[PDB]
Design a protein around this ligand. Structure first.
Ligand SMILES: *[C@@H]1O[C@H](CO)[C@@H](O)[C@H](O)[C@H]1NC(C)=O
Ligand SMILES: *[C@@H]1O[C@H](CO)[C@@H](O)[C@H](O)[C@H]1NC(C)=O
Ligand SMILES: *[C@@H]1O[C@H](CO)[C@@H](O)[C@H](O)[C@H]1NC(C)=O
Ligand SMILES: *[C@@H]1O[C@H](CO)[C@@H](O)[C@H](O)[C@H]1NC(C)=O
Lengths: 532, 532
C-alpha cells in the first residue's frame, strides 16, 4: 500500500487527499516526542517510544495550548491564525504530504510556523502543504512545537525548566525527519527548513545552534531573523518573567523547585490567562516567553556568533513584506482601528513611538521621531500612520533581517533576498494595513491556485512562480532554473547587495534594501542608547 | 553749498560724485570717535572731540587693522574683500551718500560690514552706496568698527579690555547718526541698520542690547544672526583666548594689567600674526576674537533674551543665500580646492564633519554624518561635496537664523524672510561653490546697474527689485509697495512661516525654510550633546 509506511518508530497509515483534481498522500499527526504533560511540562522533549501496530495518520493532531485571539470574533482575517483543532499539551506531532506515486529520494521542505513564540498551529488552512507538495513534487513536512510558557519558560540553572524547550521540540522533529523521511520518499540529505515570523527566527536559530546544524541542508526565512528584538531574552530577564508568572498565580517563590512545582499543578489556561502580565514595559511587538540566550542552545551572544562565523554555512533565501508593522499597531497602538483609515494625530504618533521602542530613553525616542517625521507636513494623518507602520516594521523585522543577511553573507555559500509587496486582491483587512505580515504565506503554499478562493489569474501566476522559486532553491540552492529564459533572481553579495521585488509585475532588481533606515536602527540608535 | 554740512561735531565738506550719468553728494571719512590708539587700544571708544574749521570729507578713510587674505594672490574673488585703503588703528570713520538736491527728512540706511569680526572694510567697491542712495533716494551711511583683537579682546572684569568694544564702535556711529543725520537731510526717526554676516549678527546684537535699541527704527540681517555659533563666546573662553594671545607674544601673564600692558606695546601686525593660534579646536567657521556674553552689552544669555522677549520689538527683514558653507570648506577643509570640482571622498567627508562641528563628541559626529549621508550612494563625490556645503551652511548660518526668526516673530511687529539663490553670471569662483556667502551684497548695492560690470539684463532687474524691497522696507516697515500690481512678498508668521526666493524667476512663496535640517541643528543635536 501507498498509504502504509514503515518507520523506525513504527508503521503509519496515511490518507489519500484530493488536490487540484488529482490526489496525493498525507500522513497527518505523526508523533515525534513523548507527550510533554504532567511532570514533563517545561522539560526538554523526549523521543517518542516506538509503537506496535499501525498509527492512524489520517487526521490532523491537536494544537499546542496557546493564547487565542478573540479581538475580532467571527472575522476570518484574525481567526485564520487561531487554532482550528482542540488544544492540548499533547501536541508534538508532524504532518507529511507525499507526491503520488511515492517518490524515491526527492527534495524535502520542513515548515516551521510563526506566531511570536506564543501561538501557532501546523494545521491552519493556510499551511495546507498539499498544493506545494503536488505542484513542485516535493515531500512537504510541517512540524509543531510548544509555545508560550509551555515552550519557553526559562529558569536557567534548573533542569526542570531550562528554557528553549520549544526550540528543542523543533530540533527533535528535524531529527525524526533526518532519521525517517527516506521511508516516505524523501532525501534526508536535501532538507530545507523554512518558516515565517517566529518560524523564520527559529530557522535562523537552528543555523546558529551547533546542536541543530547537521539536521538540514539549507534554509528559508520569511519576515523573521534570529537577532530580532522580540525573539530572545537574556537568562536574567527570562528568570524575572518566570518568577513574575508565579507571582501572578500565587506561587511559592522560595526556590526554582517550589516555583516549577506550583506552575505544573496549574491548568494550561491558568498560565495563559496571566501570560501577558509579565512583560517589563508597556510595549507592542514584545512577547512574554521566547528563546533565551542560555550558553547551551546558543553558546554565546547572537551578535558574536554572527560576527565570528559561528554558524552553519549553506545557502539561504529570505525576505520581508512591505508593511510588517501594521499588525501590531492595530492591536496595541492608540488611534488605530480595524474599520477606519486610522489617520494618526501628532500625539498618537508620539505614543506609538514609545510603545515601539520601549527600551529607549527620551533622547532615543527623539532620535526615532526625528528620523520618521516629515517636518514640512507633521500633522498629515496618513504620513503619521505610515510612519509608525515603518517604525514598527523596520525596528522589529526588516532591519534585524538586513543585519542578519549582511553578517551571514560574509561566511555563507549563497544568499537570495526578496521584498514581497503585492497586496492580495481578496484581503479582508483594511487597506491602510498594506502588505501585511504573513500574507505572503498563502502564495508560498499555493492557495491562489484554488479558484474558489477568489484570487486573480495574476495572483495564481505569482503563487506558482514563488512556489517554484522556493522549491527550486530547496532542491539546488538556487531559486532560478538553469538555462531558463525567465528573468533571473540575482545573488545577494556583500558588495552589491541586490534583491528582487515579489509581485505581479515584471521582476525588478534593487540594491540596499531600506539601508537608510537600517543604518539608523542597526548602527546609530544602538550607539546612542549605549552612550546615554 | 550743497557739499558743506554743519554738524554738532563741526563742519564737513563733501564731494560731488557721478553715478549712472547723474551725480550725488558723498561725505567720506567722517570721524565719529577718538582714535583708539596707544593706551586706548582695547578700550571702549570715546566720542570724537568737536573740531574747528572744515573737515575734508572728500576721500575714503583708513581701514582698521586686520588679517589680510593672501590665499589667492591677484584673484579678484578674494581680494575684493581685502582692505583697499592703508590699514590703521585710526580707523573709526563713517561715510554718507546723500541724494542731490539735499533731501529734507528722508529714510536713512546704515550699513554694517561683515567679515567674521576679524576683518571688514567700509570702503570696498562692493559697498559703494552711491547707486542705492541715488536709485532709492535715501541717505546711505556705512560705518566702521574695530575687528580682531583690537575690537574684541575680552578680559572681563577689567576696564582696560572689557570686550565688545567693536560693537560699542558701531553703537557710537549709530549715536552720531541719531544726533547729526538731520543736517544731511536724513530722518533720525527712520533709520534702518542692515548688515551681512558678522554685520547681520551685529544688527541682531543691537536689537538685543538695551544700550543700542533706541538708536534705530528697524533692521535687516543678511546671512547673519546674533545666536550664530561663531558670533559669540563666553567670558571664560574670551579670557582664555586673550591669555593664550599673550602667551603667543611672550607676555607677562601674572595679571590682567600686565597682559594688557604687554599687548599694547605690540605693533598691530604682531597681534594679527598670531591671532589664529588661540582657537580651542581644529575647526572651520570659527574666529578668535568675537563678541562676549558679558552681562553688560548682553544682560543675560542670548537664548534667554530671545525666549523672554528681552529685545527691541520692530519690523525685520532677513534671509540667507543657498550655499553659505562653500566658502569656508574651500579655505579649510581637505579635498576642496579652487580650480577643481572638489569631489569629496567618503573619508574627506568625515574629516570635514569633524572640522564643522568641533564641539561635538563622537556620537554627535555620527548623528550629523547620518543626517547628511545618502546611504544608497555614499561614495558619490558630488553628494559628499554638497552634503558638507549644507552641513556648514545649516549649522553656522541658516539654522541659527531660522531659530532667531522664529523666536523674534513671537514678539516682533513684522517679519519678512528671503532665500537668495541666484548665482551671478559673472562669478569668478568655481561653480561648485554655488550661491556664495556675500554674493547677494552686489545686488543689494546695485552693482548690476553698471554695464561695465557685465551683468545680464535680468540681473539688473533683480538688483533694482531687491534695492526697492530693502529701501521700501526701510521707509515703511514693509518691502511691498501699497496698491502695486507686482507679486507680493508675504509676512512671515509664527503659524505659516512663509518666505520668498530671490532670483531672476517669477516670485515663489514657500514655507518652513530648511525645517527638516534645522530641527536637527536647533533641537535634536543640542539635546544629544547635553545628555552625552
Ligand atoms: C482514523 O481516525 C479517524 C478519527 O475519527 C476515523 O474516522 C478513521 O476511520 C480512522 N481510520 C482507521 C483506519 O482507523
Ligand atoms: C559555495 O562553495 C563552493 C565550494 O564548496 C564554491 O565553489 C562556490 O563558489 C561557493 N558559492 C558561493 C556563492 O559562495
Ligand atoms: C582733500 O584731501 C585730498 C587728499 O589728497 C585732496 O586731494 C583734496 O584736494 C582735499 N580737498 C580740500 C578741499 O582740501
Ligand atoms: C504692529 O503694531 C501695531 C500696534 O502698534 C499693530 O496695530 C500691528 O498689527 C502690528 N503688526 C504686526 C505685524 O504685528
Amino acid at each position: 500500500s501507498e498509504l502504509l509506511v514503515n518507520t523506525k518508530s513504527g508503521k503509519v497509515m496515511g490518507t489519500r487527499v484530493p488536490v487540484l483534481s488529482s490526489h496525493i498522500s498525507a500522513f497527518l499527526g505523526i508523533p515525534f516526542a513523548e507527550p510533554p504533560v504532567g511532570n514533563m511540562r517545561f522539560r526538554r522533549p523526549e523521543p517518542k517510544k516506538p509503537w506496535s501496530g499501525v498509527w492512524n495518520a489520517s487526521t490532523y493532531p491537536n494544537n499546542c495550548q496557546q493564547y487565542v485571539d478573540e479581538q475580532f470574533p467571527g472575522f476570518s482575517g484574525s481567526e485564520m491564525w487561531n487554532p482550528n483543532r482542540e488544544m492540548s499539551e499533547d501536541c508534538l506531532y508532524l504532518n507529511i504530504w507525499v507526491p503520488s506515486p511515492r517518490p524515491k529520494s526527492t527534495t524535502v521542505m520542513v515548515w516551521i510556523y510563526g506566531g511570536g513564540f506564543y501561538s501557532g498551529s501546523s494545521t491552519l488552512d493556510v499551511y495546507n502543504g498539499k498544493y506545494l507538495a503536488y505542484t513542485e513534487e516535493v515531500v512537504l513536512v510541517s512540524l509543531s512545537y510548544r509555545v508560550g510558557a509551555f515552550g519557553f519558560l526559562a529558569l536557567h540553572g534548573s533542569q526542570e525548566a531550562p528554557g528553549n524547550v520549544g526550540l528543542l521540540d523543533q530540533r527533535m522533529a528535524l531529527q525524526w525527519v533526518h532519521d525517517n523521511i527516506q521511508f516516505f520518499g524523501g532525501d534526508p540529505k536535501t532538507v530545507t527548513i523554512f518558516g515565517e515570523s517566529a518560524g523564520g527566527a527559529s530557522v535562523g536559530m537552528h543555523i546558529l545552534s551547533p546542536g541543530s546544524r547537521d539536521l538540514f541542508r539549507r534554509a528559508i526565512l520569511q519576515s523573521g531573523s534570529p537577532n530580532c528584538p522580540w525573539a530572545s531574552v537574556s537568562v536574567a530577564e527570562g528568570r524575572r518573567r518566570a518568577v513574575e508568572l508565579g507571582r501572578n498565580l500565587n506561587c511559592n517563590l522560595n526556590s526554582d523547585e517550589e516555583l516549577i512545582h506550583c506552575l505544573r499543578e496549574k491548568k494550561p489556561q491558568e498560565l495563559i490567562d496571566v501570560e501577558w502580565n509579565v512583560l517589563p514595559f508597556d510595549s507592542i511587538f514584545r512577547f512574554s516567553f521566547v528563546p533565551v540566550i542560555d550558553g547551551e542552545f546558543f553558546p554565546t551572544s547572537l551578535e558574536s556568533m554572527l560576527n565570528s562565523g559561528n554558524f552553519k554555512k549553506t545557502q539561504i533565501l529570505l525576505g520581508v513584506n512591505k508593511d510588517e508593522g501594521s499588525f501590531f499597531l492595530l492591536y496595541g497602538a492608540p488611534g488605530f482601528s480595524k474599520d477606519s483609515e486610522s489617520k494618526i494625530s501628532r500625539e498618537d504618533f508620539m505614543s506609538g513611538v514609545k510603545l515601539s521602542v520601549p527600551h529607549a530613553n527620551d533622547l532615543g525616542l527623539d532620535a526615532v521621531t526625528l528620523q520618521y517625521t516629515d517636518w514640512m507636513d507633521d500633522n498629515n494623518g496618513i504620513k503619521n500612520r505610515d510612519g509608525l507602520d515603518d517604525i514598527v516594521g523596520d525596528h522589529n523585522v526588516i532591519c534585524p533581517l538586513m543585519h542578519f543577511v549582511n553578517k551571514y553573507t560574509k561566511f555563507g555559500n549563497g544568499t537570495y533576498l526578496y521584498f514581497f509587496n503585492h497586496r492580495a486582491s481578496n484581503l479582508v483587512w483594511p487597506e491602510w494595513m498594506g502588505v501585511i505580515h504573513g500574507y505572503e504565506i498563502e502564495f508560498v503554499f499555493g492557495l491562489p491556485l484554488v479558484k474558489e478562493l477568489n484570487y486573480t489569474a495574476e495572483e495564481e501566476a505569482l503563487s506558482r512562480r514563488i512556489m517554484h522559486y522556493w522549491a527550486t532553491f530547496a532542491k539546488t540552492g538556487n531559486p532560478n532554473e538553469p538555462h531558463s529564459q525567465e528573468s533571473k533572481w540575482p545573488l545577494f553579495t556583500t558588495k552589491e547587495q541586490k534583491f528582487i521585488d515579489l509581485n505581479t509585475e515584471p521582476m525588478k532588481v534593487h540594491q540596499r534594501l531600506r539601508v537608510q533606515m537600517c543604518v539608523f536602527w542597526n548602527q546609530f540608535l544602538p550607539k546612542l542608547l549605549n552612550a546615554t
